[PDB]
Structure 1
Amino acid sequence: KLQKQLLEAVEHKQLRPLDVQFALTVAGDEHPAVTLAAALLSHDAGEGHVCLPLSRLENNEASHPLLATCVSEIGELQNWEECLLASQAVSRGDEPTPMILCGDRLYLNRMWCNERTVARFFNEVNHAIEVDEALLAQTLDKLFPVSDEINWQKVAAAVALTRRISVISGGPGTGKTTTVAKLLAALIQMADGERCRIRLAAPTGKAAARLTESLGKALRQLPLTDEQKKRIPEDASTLHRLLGAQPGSQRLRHHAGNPLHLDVLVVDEASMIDLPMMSRLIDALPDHARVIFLGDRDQLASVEAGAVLGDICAYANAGFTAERARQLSRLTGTHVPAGTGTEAASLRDSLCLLQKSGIGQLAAAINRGDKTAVKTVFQQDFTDIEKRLLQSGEDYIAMLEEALAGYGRYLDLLQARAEPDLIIQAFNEYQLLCALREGPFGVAGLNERIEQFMQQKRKIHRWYEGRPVMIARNDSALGLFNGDIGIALDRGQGTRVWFAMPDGNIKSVQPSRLPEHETTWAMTVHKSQGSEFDHAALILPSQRTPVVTRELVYTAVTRARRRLSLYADERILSAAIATRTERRSGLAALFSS
């Protein structure tokens, strides 16, 4: 049968052994269409894709040419719905079946319960919190001085207070953290006698400590009494620690039985919240708790496979409902625009987008046509943006030459023999970002060419002295997590890599003690999310591939604090701006119902 045919896919490395064995056990002896349909489903679910629509599996334009072995099996019945549902391996959701076929999208019961729990929590179970509109308006007037024009931050605070579940969307440097402080300050000042328990959470401890310091600076800008400053949250912890995720097992200390003891919860950088964690967080929330999410719609983690926030803010472009536009007008004391038509009432009213912030002008021109993009990178130069046309290999070497200029201050501090703590802060001044993983332009491509450029030039000789290293996977024992950087040097006790704890203390780790490490001189745009970098450079291939997308280049530009540089083709970069990441998740289809 198709079994031995699937055994070639392991040697072809198109399928993991988990996908093939899951396909033989669940589908069994039924038609080979059902066997390979569970095979590509387990493969896409392994890469993070939520579902497998039937239209993609049917078209010959799809990947994994093993698919071309289906024409000899499925015999062109042209009906994937009649063949799959007939077998016991696929059902409509009534029977306890591994695979579920509903809206033409086939996917596992795990992804089906997670999609149903998330889409329902935003559509249902949420209640509109009714409070005095006069008092709530007087509070927002004292927080925001300018009432003459419509303030997006004032609507974001009004929407989050009037609704239990809400999301505040905006780009980096747009004042998101400051708006949260105004939201938390107006929240504690609203209920004087009622208990207010605030919790700060982030998917990563990095952005968590970024949330505590940034929320601290913004909250001290507003007056509060001793009772309000007593209810001010202390610190943020990792979302896994908040739910009490055990390192050894998958069990959680909260789940359905034990709810989180809270009043309101603020989750920063919700873009890194994949569908499993959003569904696991919803059942842990009590009925009296309000939750606020932070992030951007165009961040790559929002459009990545398995993400939630990407499809949630996709309906925010329609605008507020006609009624809420009148209600928010009575709250903020301004004229709030009303969205045309009625699509989803509960979802659109719980969303807000902050449009007020060279980095900002370029990112705003990304969503528009390429005519504004090419014009922004060109004239006036903004001092924060530069462009180098890269076609021939001679411009590819000059790319590595300016790449040394960004690391020029960093490479010297390595050779100047500084302390690890300052060098950890120094490696955050420059980083390299590349779309592809492999090829002449990519993570696997640059790390070889960059280290080869480190052999040609005598800056550092090759674990080599002064090397930066990043952690590939999380480690619970050493306290270091994926996306964190470290510096390896000899203090005189030995060659050891050093890390900066959130408490400020340095922690020495032997080179053999790190669970995973890799050359961090170039980073994957998805792995650098949440980190800050003073200077950044984008590396895009001369080849045309769907891998390069809009949200990838966006997260590359937003990854730079101030300085930024680009090496790309005007034909390749601008065309990739038009191409956006395609999401298969059936969440946006349920919101239309």
Structure 2
Amino acid sequence: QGLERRLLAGLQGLGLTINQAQRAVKHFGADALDRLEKDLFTLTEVEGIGFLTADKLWQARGGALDDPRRLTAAAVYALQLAGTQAGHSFLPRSRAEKGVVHYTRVTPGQARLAVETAVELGRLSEDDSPLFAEAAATGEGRIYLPHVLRAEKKLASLIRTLLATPPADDDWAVPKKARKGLSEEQASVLDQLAGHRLVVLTGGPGTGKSTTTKAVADLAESLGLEVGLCAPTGKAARRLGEVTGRTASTVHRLLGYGPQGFRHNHLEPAPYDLLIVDEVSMMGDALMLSLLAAVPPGARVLLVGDTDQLPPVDAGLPLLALAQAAPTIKLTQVYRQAAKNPIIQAAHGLLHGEAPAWGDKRLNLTEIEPDGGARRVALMVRELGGPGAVQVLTPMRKGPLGMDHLNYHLQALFNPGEGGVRIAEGEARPGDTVVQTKNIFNGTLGMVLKAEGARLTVDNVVELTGAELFNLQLGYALTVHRAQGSEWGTVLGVLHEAHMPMLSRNLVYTALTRARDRFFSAGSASAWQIAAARQREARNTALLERIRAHL
């Protein structure tokens, strides 16, 4: 599988690292060197080596800025960037063209040609088929990365078959027994699964998705069914298991992921009569496709999530599409006890577009500016009683009110110190509360006990290797995204106009829902009014349409 000497030498001769040379060859085969001699921008499609790398080498050797191969590849990059920076599955043709202008600063005619060339070469796909509603009316087709279009169609297809075929080997029945503990709405989930292969369960914080899910697990297994429980993250999986009293795992591990791909698929389905997936709000199309591809013929799937939480980082909104297309139980009654909680109340206000009624011993905001703000947040945390007592959250990593700068100040306030060992950003010193960023697993807090030159020991108990140093950062403050699935008694949420592009309803909702007992904000009240008012950035996705053209 290794590279022939002169192949490698030549590839490095174009400015590629060894790793890049390996990726190129995996992608192209032996004539990789010939392909990149003919078209260096052919690198745009190789995972790990993008357009940006192709462009740096290209300009480095005085290659023409308006060379059609660059422009063609810029068309592809526009779509790649659409998915990357905003989760789109496609762009209307005029936006794809605009994408190219924006980046390459060529004329519209040059950009139109670049999109046209990409399509006729099959580096991009064009679809203008009406479906249910779109492309013929607005007179503009959708441009996709080819695999994304194939993937969106396949997903809708699996979903369609799942909706349209009843569960079978069937002897699923719902004894009055199994309904105990559950309300009318919750119990219904058990009924719904008697007749249907695909069922969605949604609802917010105080609605009882956990008991409801456990009850599904219980009933199924009493019927002899083999039940697979999973979630998109390690932490989420760990929690599912905890509340279910069972072994729950990552969607990747459940589907037998490895370097060789997903082990489970249509050829070797996941051996489970029922799949329970929690936190589906975090799932993009690609992973949903992988999961559903692995569902045995006739087998069941329960998808559970909260549609008001942050959308997936990856492209698509499949839980949102499915919530509109599948049998879905939307749980709404809040537990009378938890009906009182000022935070639960402020969270529900967000859903009607209102910012929270600040001015309470358990829910209040302190107005601050970005200048010195971080230092101030540290003093606030001290007022609330130290970082053991409060978790700091923020929309962004970067900038004055962001995670890196907030950790820096927190450390300085509570753990002043000279010489630590360097990690993701900054350095770890004994007494530091750090966060594991990679899968034991990602998201988990801890406590540093000691360091050395380039060696680090923290607590569970283990050391820290030079490559592992990259997979660790200070934990006193986290991004709202990183805090997904986790909960604390008291959280200090930083939110301000300085976080402008992140100010949406879903972001503030997730943040608010991280707090069990108390939630204090630092920033501006106006920043909350914006977030409450503003829906999350729109995503281009034709999945719902496809499921419904099908039906």
Q: TM-score, normalised by structure 2?
A: 0.74
Contact 1:539 1:567 in 2 (8 A): yes
- Residues of 2 paired with 1:257 and 1:132: CA distance? 26
Within-5 A mapping of 1:456-535: 463-474=428-439, 480-490=440-450, 496-499=456-459, 506-510=460-464, 512=466, 514-515=468-469, 516-535=471-490
Within-5 A mapping of 1:309-348: 309-312=318-321, 315=324, 347-348=325-326
Which of 26, 33, 50 is the aligned partner of 1:18?
50
Q: Deviations over 1:427-457 (max 9, x none)?
A: xx53211112222221233233434445779
Tell me the SS of whatever aligns to 2:461: strand
1:590 matched to 2:546? The reply is yes
Q: Measure how far apart 1:487 and its partner are.
A: 2.0
Q: Residues 140 and 359 (structure 1 numbering): CA distance in 2 closer, same or farther, change over 3 Å?
A: same
Which of 232, 241, 260 is the aligned partner of 2:253?
241
Task: Show the counterpart of 2:226.
Answer: 197
1:356 matched to 2:333? The reply is yes
Q: Measure how far apart 1:206 and its partner are.
A: 2.2
Q: Residues 299 and 39 (structure 1 numbering): CA distance in 2 closer, same or farther, change over 3 Å?
A: same
Task: Show the counterpart of 1:419.
Answer: none
Q: Residues 252 and 162 (structure 1 numbering): CA distance in 2 closer, same or farther, change over 3 Å?
A: same
Tell me the SS of whatever aligns to 1:293: strand
Which of 398, 405, 410 is the aligned partner of 1:445?
405
Q: Measure how far apart 1:566 and its partner are.
A: 1.0
Task: Show the counterpart of 1:183.
Answer: 216
Task: Show the counterpart of 1:389.
Answer: 367
Alignment-mate amino acid for residue 110 of structure 2: E
Task: Show the counterpart of 1:41.
Answer: 79
Which of 372, 375, 378 is the aligned partner of 1:400?
378
Q: Deviations over 1:467-518 (max 9, x none)?
A: 12222333xxxxx3322333210499x974344xxxxxx2322354625111
- Residues of 1 paired with 2:382 and 2:81: CA distance? 39
Contact 1:278 1:308 in 2 (8 A): no
Q: Measure how far apart 1:91 and its partner are.
A: 4.2
Q: Residues 30 and 89 (structure 1 numbering): CA distance in 2 closer, same or farther, change over 3 Å?
A: farther
1:306 matched to 2:315? The reply is yes
Q: Measure how far apart 1:44 and its partner are.
A: 3.4
Which of 391, 401, 408 is the aligned partner of 1:431?
391
Q: Deviations over 1:277-298 (max 9, x none)?
A: 2111122111121011121101
1:107 matched to 2:144? The reply is yes
Q: Deviations over 1:298-321 (max 9, x none)?
A: 111x35442444432563xxxxxx
Q: Deviations over 1:357-405 (max 9, x none)?
A: 32211111111132xx34x334xx2x53221122474766443211234
- Residues of 2 paired with 1:433 and 1:52: CA distance? 32
Within-5 A mapping of 1:277-316: 277-300=287-310, 302-312=311-321, 315=324
Q: Deviations over 1:2-59 (max 9, x none)?
A: x9xxx9xxxxxxxx950246799xxx97587543211212333445734231267268
Contact 2:431 2:448 in 1 (8 A): yes
Contact 2:365 2:525 in 1 (8 A): no
Tell me the SS of whatever aligns to 2:82: helix
1:551 matched to 2:506? The reply is yes
Task: Show the counterpart of 2:25.
Answer: none
Q: Residues 578 and 406 (structure 1 numbering): CA distance in 2 closer, same or farther, change over 3 Å?
A: same
Alignment-mate amino acid for residue 407 of structure 2: N
Q: Deviations over 1:230-278 (max 9, x none)?
A: xxxx4112222222222xx242322232222121111122223232221
Task: Show the counterpart of 2:7.
Answer: none
Alignment RMSD, CA only?
4.1
Contact 1:388 1:566 in 2 (8 A): yes
- Residues of 2 paired with 1:519 and 1:305: CA distance? 25
Within-5 A mapping of 1:91-240: 91-92=125-126, 104-126=141-163, 127-129=165-167, 136=174, 138-139=176-177, 142-144=180-182, 151-189=184-222, 191=223, 195-216=224-245, 234-240=246-252
Alignment-mate amino acid for residue 267 of structure 1: V
5+ long unaligned stretches in structure 2: 1-35, 41-47, 59-65, 129-134, 335-341, 422-426
5+ long unaligned stretches in structure 1: 8-15, 95-100, 217-233, 316-346, 411-428, 475-479, 500-505
Aligned residues: 472
Which of 572, 575, 579 is the aligned partner of 2:527?
572
Which of 482, 490, 495 is the aligned partner of 1:540?
495
Contact 1:384 1:562 in 2 (8 A): yes
Q: Residues 507 and 309 (structure 1 numbering): CA distance in 2 closer, same or farther, change over 3 Å?
A: farther
Q: Residues 141 and 473 (structure 1 numbering): CA distance in 2 closer, same or farther, change over 3 Å?
A: closer
Tell me the SS of whatever aligns to 1:508: coil
Contact 1:205 1:237 in 2 (8 A): yes
- Residues of 1 paired with 2:76 and 2:115: CA distance? 14
Tell me the SS of whatever aligns to 2:50: helix
Q: TM-score, normalised by structure 1?
A: 0.69
Alignment-mate amino acid for residue 231 of structure 2: A
Which of 239, 251, 264 is the aligned partner of 2:261?
251
- Residues of 1 paired with 2:407 and 2:449: CA distance? 20
Contact 2:96 2:143 in 1 (8 A): no
Q: Measure how far apart 1:585 and its partner are.
A: 2.4
Q: Measure how far apart 1:555 and its partner are.
A: 1.2
- Residues of 1 paired with 2:205 and 2:313: CA distance? 18
- Residues of 1 paired with 2:194 and 2:523: CA distance? 44
- Residues of 1 paired with 2:391 and 2:272: CA distance? 39
- Residues of 2 paired with 1:296 and 1:266: CA distance? 15
Contact 1:549 1:577 in 2 (8 A): yes
Which of 242, 265, 274 is the aligned partner of 1:264?
274
- Residues of 2 paired with 1:433 and 1:484: CA distance? 15
Alignment-mate amino acid for residue 111 of structure 1: V
1:51 matched to 2:89? The reply is yes
Tell me the SS of whatever aligns to 1:123: helix
Tell me the SS of whatever aligns to 1:481: coil
- Residues of 2 paired with 1:438 and 1:254: CA distance? 39
**Percentage identity across paired residues of the two chains:** 25
Alignment-mate amino acid for residue 333 of structure 2: K
Q: Measure how far apart 1:114 and its partner are.
A: 2.4
Task: Show the counterpart of 2:62.
Answer: none
Contact 1:488 1:495 in 2 (8 A): no
1:73 matched to 2:110? The reply is yes
Q: Residues 351 and 81 (structure 1 numbering): CA distance in 2 closer, same or farther, change over 3 Å?
A: farther
Q: Residues 111 and 206 (structure 1 numbering): CA distance in 2 closer, same or farther, change over 3 Å?
A: same
